[PDB]
């Protein structure tokens, strides 16, 4: 089972990217996570789209098409999804036959804030309706006070979080 991990943050020390990197080693046997790189995706402009998909967007769409499931790591800024993540989704969601259609998925997120990306997750779930993506409802993974969840580089010190992430991946497999 091929899972495409999508981090909504571009910063080097991203808690969400670190969560996905850790997730790669928490999958059950028979499953593997490949990471999407959305750093080359430009801000959306219909006038640009009309001339064709930028190479970075085409690559992203190709990865989504090839994936059996999706794993979103969504940062939360100003009580909603990070604009960068939404922008990437906006690009990949364009016609023809946008690739998110029918894909099962899991959502997780990390934030320094108290609610560990909860608000961004429910907004994303609304967006997923239009894309016809089917996200797991349980378990939910909202890592709060993320500054204390990781050490050097990006290892998870929160075993509870590691367990829940392990559960989502086991759910996608099923």
Swiss-Prot record:
The EC number(s) this enzyme carries: 1.-.-.-
InterPro entries (alphabetical): Flavoprotein-like_sf (IPR029039), FMN_Rdtase-like_dom (IPR005025), NAD(P)H-dep_reductase (IPR050712)
Binding site for NAD(+): 111-118
The protein's required cofactors: FMN
GO MF: FMN binding; FMN reductase (NADPH) activity; identical protein binding; NAD(P)H dehydrogenase (quinone) activity; oxidoreductase activity, acting on NAD(P)H, quinone or similar compound as acceptor; protein homodimerization activity
Source organism, top-level taxon: Bacteria
Residues at which FMN binds: 9-16, 77-79
Root EC class: oxidoreductase
Gene Ontology cellular component list: cytosol
UniProtKB keywords: Flavoprotein, FMN, NAD, NADP, Nucleotide-binding, Oxidoreductase
Family: Belongs to the SsuE family.
The protein's role, per its UniProt record: Has NAD(P)H-dependent FMN reductase activity.
Subunit structure as annotated in this protein's UniProt entry: Homodimer.
Protein name, as recorded: NAD(P)H-dependent FMN reductase PA1204
Source organism: Pseudomonas aeruginosa (strain ATCC 15692 / DSM 22644 / CIP 104116 / JCM 14847 / LMG 12228 / 1C / PRS 101 / PAO1)
